Design a protein around this ligand. Sequence first.
Ligand SMILES: CCCCCCCCCCCCCCCCCC(=O)OC[C@H](COP(=O)([O-])OC[C@H](O)COP(=O)([O-])OC[C@H](COC(=O)CCCCCCCCCCCCCCCCC)OC(=O)CCCCCCCCCCCCCCCCC)OC(=O)CCCCCCCCCCCCCCCCC
Ligand SMILES: CCCCCCCCCCCCCCCCCC(=O)OC[C@H](COP(=O)([O-])OCC[N+](C)(C)C)OC(=O)CCCCCCCCCCCCCCCCC
Ligand SMILES: CCCCCCCCCCCCCCCCCC(=O)OC[C@H](COP(=O)(O)OCCN)OC(=O)CCCCCCCCCCCCCCCCC
Ligand SMILES: *C(=O)CCCCCCCCCCCCC
Lengths: 55, 65, 122, 99, 128, 155, 87, 177, 459, 79, 56
Amino acid sequence: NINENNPFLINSIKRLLIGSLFAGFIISNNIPPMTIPQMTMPHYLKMTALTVTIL
Amino acid sequence: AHIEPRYRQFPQLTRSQVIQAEFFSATMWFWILWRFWHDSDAVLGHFPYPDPSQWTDEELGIPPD
Amino acid sequence: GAHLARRYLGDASVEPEPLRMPTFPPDYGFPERKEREMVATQQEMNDAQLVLQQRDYCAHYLIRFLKCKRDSFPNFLACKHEQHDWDYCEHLDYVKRMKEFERERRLLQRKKRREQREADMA
Amino acid sequence: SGYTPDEKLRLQQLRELRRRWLKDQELSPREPVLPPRRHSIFAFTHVLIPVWIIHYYLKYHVTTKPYTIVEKKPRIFPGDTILETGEVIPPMKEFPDQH
Amino acid sequence: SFPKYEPSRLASLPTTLDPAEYDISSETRKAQAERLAIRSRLKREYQLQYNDPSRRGVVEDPALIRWTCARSANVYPNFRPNTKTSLLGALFGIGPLIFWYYVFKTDRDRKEKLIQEGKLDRTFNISY
Amino acid sequence: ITKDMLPGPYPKTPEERAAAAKKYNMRVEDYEPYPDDGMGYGDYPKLPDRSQQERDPWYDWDHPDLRLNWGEPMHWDLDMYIRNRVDTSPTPVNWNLMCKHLFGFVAFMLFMFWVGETYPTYQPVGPKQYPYNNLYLERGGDPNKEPEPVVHYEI
Amino acid sequence: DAPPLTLEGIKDRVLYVLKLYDKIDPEKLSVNSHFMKDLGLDSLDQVEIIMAMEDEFGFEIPDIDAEKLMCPQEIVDYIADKKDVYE
Amino acid sequence: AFLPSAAYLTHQQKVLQLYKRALRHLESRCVHRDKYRYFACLLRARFDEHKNEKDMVKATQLLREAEKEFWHGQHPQPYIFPESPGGTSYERYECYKVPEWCLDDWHPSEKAMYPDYFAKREQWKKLRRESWEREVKQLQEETPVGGPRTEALPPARKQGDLPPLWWHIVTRPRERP
Amino acid sequence: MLKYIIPTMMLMPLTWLSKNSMIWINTTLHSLLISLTSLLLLNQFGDNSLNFSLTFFSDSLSTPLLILTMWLLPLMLMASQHHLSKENLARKKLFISMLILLQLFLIMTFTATELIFFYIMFEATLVPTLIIITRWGNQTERLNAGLYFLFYTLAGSLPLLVALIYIQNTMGSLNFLILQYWVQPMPNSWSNTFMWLACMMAFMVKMPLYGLHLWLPKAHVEAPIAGSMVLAAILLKLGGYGMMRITLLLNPITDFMAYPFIMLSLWGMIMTSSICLRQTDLKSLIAYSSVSHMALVIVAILIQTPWSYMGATALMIAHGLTSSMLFCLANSNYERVHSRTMILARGLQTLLPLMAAWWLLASLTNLALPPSINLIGELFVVMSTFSWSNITIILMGLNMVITALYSLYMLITTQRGKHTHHINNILPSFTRENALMSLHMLPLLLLSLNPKIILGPLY
Amino acid sequence: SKMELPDYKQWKIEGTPLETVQEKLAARGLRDPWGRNEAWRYMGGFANNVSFVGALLKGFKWGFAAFVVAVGAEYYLES
Amino acid sequence: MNLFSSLTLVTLILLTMPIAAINFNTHKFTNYPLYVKTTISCAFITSMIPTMMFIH
Ligand SMILES: CCCCCCCCCCCCCCCCCC(=O)OC[C@H](COP(=O)([O-])OC[C@H](O)COP(=O)([O-])OC[C@H](COC(=O)CCCCCCCCCCCCCCCCC)OC(=O)CCCCCCCCCCCCCCCCC)OC(=O)CCCCCCCCCCCCCCCCC
Ligand SMILES: CCCCCCCCCCCCCCCCCC(=O)OC[C@H](COP(=O)([O-])OCC[N+](C)(C)C)OC(=O)CCCCCCCCCCCCCCCCC
Ligand SMILES: CCCCCCCCCCCCCCCCCC(=O)OC[C@H](COP(=O)(O)OCCN)OC(=O)CCCCCCCCCCCCCCCCC
Ligand SMILES: *C(=O)CCCCCCCCCCCCC
């Protein structure tokens, strides 16, 4: 009985899908700086989160 | 017409759910590649990390005694 | 992160403690060492309502970036240059802090060589 | 082995009575016999009339009392012009250019 | 071989790992049949009243009324003051009272001694 | 209900034990009372101290939520051994082994947090440098007093 | 969602699962083919048939009911009674 | 162990129930269908090895160490069907299963909304109250002395009679009300 | 205060001259009119109490208890008219006369300017309550419950009589308004120790103190519903009222006499709340919860800070309404299943949804859900006891776990789960019953809008 | 209403991993009596499901095409 | 100042209004869940204005 074709379901997942694509970008470029971001670090230490996730 | 249930076989797909699913998958990969093309430093690194061992004793003030 | 292995598994007398340094005077090794120049006036970064963590020696780029971010609304993607200016000067401040760390480590190496030379000489 | 003949007979009789009961839980085409009983009005009754009520309440009852709506004072930059004074905030000192 | 299951107070032994589960002896057959007969007689006595069309109310359960009377009213007429109950009533009845008495008394003596020596930071404390 | 079906005192003679077992609707060989230490139990049966989760759920109970029949002598802690509460059901891992594994894991993690607190990681940098005497007026220093001059130099 | 079961549909599905079982020849099978007497199957085979019924319809049959469903019509009647078909 | 009709489980019944529990826990261990199907035929071979064992002490011993085998090799979270006890949807709809007698408590203005349903309910209630005395006297003329021995009930032996104690089995609520 | 005493007395010819079908309607109507008139007592001032005469006065402590007392009589008449429907007509009028007489004794108990008149009214309230319990209670143990309710109270109160006559002979007066100005400090002696015990132990019994509470899970349980309403909602609060009047005269010895009793409540509210986790009797669970809630009022009166008295009087009013509604809910199920065993009738939200909503609301007010005045009184007592000693938050916070854990268990056991199959006399909720639940809950929710009227003389 | 079930004779386990299972069972003297019951899961539209990197790279082809078109659009549009 | 605070309180009052609608009811609803969904969508739209003039 596999069926997901209700516009309620599709639109409700769709708006959070647009959120899960773009909302981190939009919010992170709209908020003001309240700390100082650490942006100078060695290359094994900058790539740590992505490498650990891939591993 | 709504989806009829099937028995021991692949269910009926609508054209709309398939094209929307493929469209948002292509949207995701477009966004990943686009922001990777433009930013390219939130992932790989913003500024070069200098080597402290390559620094001279003159600029750090280490008089030789 | 090799300095953690040098301080914890090696000796800590030559490695600089983070909580209390510089232990050497700032003029120790420098002919006429000049101060750091503060560009933003104390009243200017007071009236810009900056966070007290953010009122460092490079807050004038942050003031320029926040004025850009106010003036370029709703186009929130239109101040990448001022943001990169502030990020680059924070990077330069971080490089200066690394230079202070390496300076203190080299002077502790100098003191280690000094006391070993004094033990081997007399 | 499975059921005894008494168990088969009892389950058949209970099954017949149960299927009659479940059939008799159905509805008539007249049932339920009920007794005999503007495009954007949601933007008017639920939004705009509350904006009216809340603006009246805040303007003439809340802001007429001290320290009820206290706003953070706006952020002042070097190079601004004050609206209440006209006093131009003087711009920053020239930068020791880094790049 | 396999680690033996060690049953506890809050994690009992399984039905299939109990060595009395595999009793084919005639006395256990008699016990299981007599428990079956008691349970069937109580079941029949329940569902004669439960399926009654004339009955409109509560099928009273004398097991339940018996349980509530044992939990509530039978406790004092079957109490005897002896060594065990006296030590448990002194340990659990006045013991924590003595304990919290000395704790709160020591705390308030320390606090009052700090206050009347001008030592406790009581700078903005004006709600009490 | 009447007098001779209510709970009574502790049975000592075997005929009183048999009348008690007949009262609580159970066999004499299965009827154990609580030990007569004077705690207030009387003749009430010590049922074998199981939760009601362990009862057979596919059996047709008179009370399906409680898994309990009508007329069945209830446990003394029946309100305690309901399925909303304390379970005694058999666990896949031994109870002592569960206690040893959980205590070892929690104690080892707290010990390693103490170790990492004693040996913290950091970055090869100096202190963050702030102008105006480490921001003396900003941090709440009074303007009538004057701080000692905190001076940071170029490097 | 949730299509209603009928006696004919349940009968079709039970006989369909039994026609896909390689210890029953699908031409001898009928609705009253007793598994131990007519079809000549083991009690282990009866347990596996009831477990395939559970995997087919999605609900567990208890063992006190599983050890007594000895023809496919008993299985259809049991699923009917536990699912209330022909409402 | 604990059954309504029988006082006990036979040895054969214990072997069957251990076989079914072992295959369910094996399916919980062996998620994919081909891999489960392979190890399930292997377990069927392990149960076929000791099928023709005539020493009942030896068969009971093998069943006991097979239970210890199963208890070592069980899954910590076995697969439970959603409406099976321990399931995610188990006893979910019990809040919607209102009993039939509450329909007697309805107001006549909300009974008049369904005239045919309550007119049809009246003959069910009438059939029940005329069958009740016949099925009570059927139960008392057939139950042995000392009470009933098992919880099984007799069927309707005559024509026109209904089986005894039938109302709360027939008029139970649906599984999806 | 004579404008409330005379209408309460005119309720006696109003009930003894009414027609036989009319004695509930007329008494309900005119007791609601007296309760409407009770709001004139809210003429309170920030400095001066509302001092009517030589005999009667009303500050902001007596005023909410008066409003609650005069409001509780119509609600008791609604709660008690069902189970006394088959009662004899003259015994029905005697029941109503005992409730009227109890209201009469209470409304001049709370306004008694002089303390021996306070004592006479305070002990005059025993006799209608005793008669209601032992005459219209349902079970055999109503007689023993009446004996316990009488003889803990009198054994507490007769040393209070001796001590108040001693204050009369020493200070010259027992006017509370005079004793606000002539109060002498009470030094450390054994004579003043037993002075303190004689002035306090009667109210310790009436609160009840833990260890002296044994009369209550009989007297609240064996009573009829109007008896349980007036015992829980008003008659426990005579102890707290009398403590707040009498601890003026007991300084500074109270600052070291309070130490045992504070322990007896701070541990006792842990115990009785724990006891509510294992109560099979629902009405006994509500009784032990009343002991658990009044233990906080005992602590708040003994530590004698302003936040503590404000939280204590807020918690007294809030607990009056909440426990009265909880007993009325327990009676609404007892009138159907005819057993007070809580495990008997389950799953009642499937059968009675609006009554289960009332159960939910009374449970949430029992567990002190903000911003209810239950939470306001609870919270202010917790603030003042933290300022008293910082460790007490443990015994406070642990209490607030267990207070949740029996309140929702009472909600889960009675209303949730599968309904009981063999119980089939569960009628729909009568309009009288839902009216009773709303007349408890709606004032308790409206008082969160303006809680300053139930925060005592030192708000 | 009346639903038509498909034929039971079309579910054959050749070409599926049930065939590998039956061969490894016949290698030690066993036979697989529930193969055709499980045969529908490995046949029809549920045969040849994607790999995990094929799951993640769903829509990567059209996304890469739209990426190259947009990069060429901004590379021409700057001039 | 007058826009910000007004739409701020409008968001909360607008969210409270279907609670008053479900408590002040007689009829079987003409899709009350659609009403609450429309209400929360419009409260989101209303709350975006103080958010944007915070970003400014
Ligand atoms: C002076 C003027 C004042 C005007 C404003 C009113 C102020 C409060 C007054 C009392 C409010 C409650 C009364 C209604 C509920 C009780 C009866 C009921 O359940 O009916 C259900 C029924 C609707 O349900 P249904 O589908 O028909 O059938 C029910 C089902 O059987 C089963 O239903 P169910 O179980 O599905 O639903 C029950 C559900 C159950 O809902 C819950 O359990 C959720 C609530 C708790 C958690 C969430 C709230 C937590 C606290 C935050 C809110 C307060 C502060 C908010 C402000 C911002 C922060 C400070 O109840 C609600 O949702 C009620 C919403 C309002 C709840 C108020 C708080 C009660 C919780 C416990 C105490 C909390 C602390 C005290 C708060 C006091 C605030 C003043 O309601 C009605 O028919 C309404 C009847 C008439 C109501 C009259 C209200 C006024 C009474 C006073 C009269 C005199 C003054 C004149 C005022 C007139 C105003 C018009
Ligand atoms: C609920 C059960 C428990 C109830 C507990 C009730 C309180 C417990 C203590 C009560 C003590 C007796 C009344 C004291 C009145 C004090 C008035 C006063 O001025 O005192 C100072 C006076 C002082 O005398 P004086 O004031 O005339 O003298 C002038 C002042 N000096 C002393 C400086 C010269 O005290 C006394 O004269 C004696 C007081 C103690 C009395 C001891 C006997 C009674 C013992 C306790 C009995 C408790 C209840 C027993 C029943 C239990 C149930 C069956
Ligand atoms: C920064 C600091 C951080 C510190 C962290 C460490 C400290 C806390 C340590 C843990 C303490 C709480 C955990 C233990 C109690 C858990 C109770 C509970 O939820 O039990 C659940 C149980 C049934 O649930 P379950 O069996 O899981 O369900 C399976 C599905 N049938 O439900 C039941 O059986 C119902 C039981 C109802 C009565 C409960 C009685 C016990 C109450 C305990 C209160 C503890 C208060 C501690 C106060 C501390 C104050 C500082
Ligand atoms: C020295 O190494 C400084 C970095 C901080 C301490 C070591 C952190 C190790 C984990 C992060 C890198 C992981 C690489 C796979």
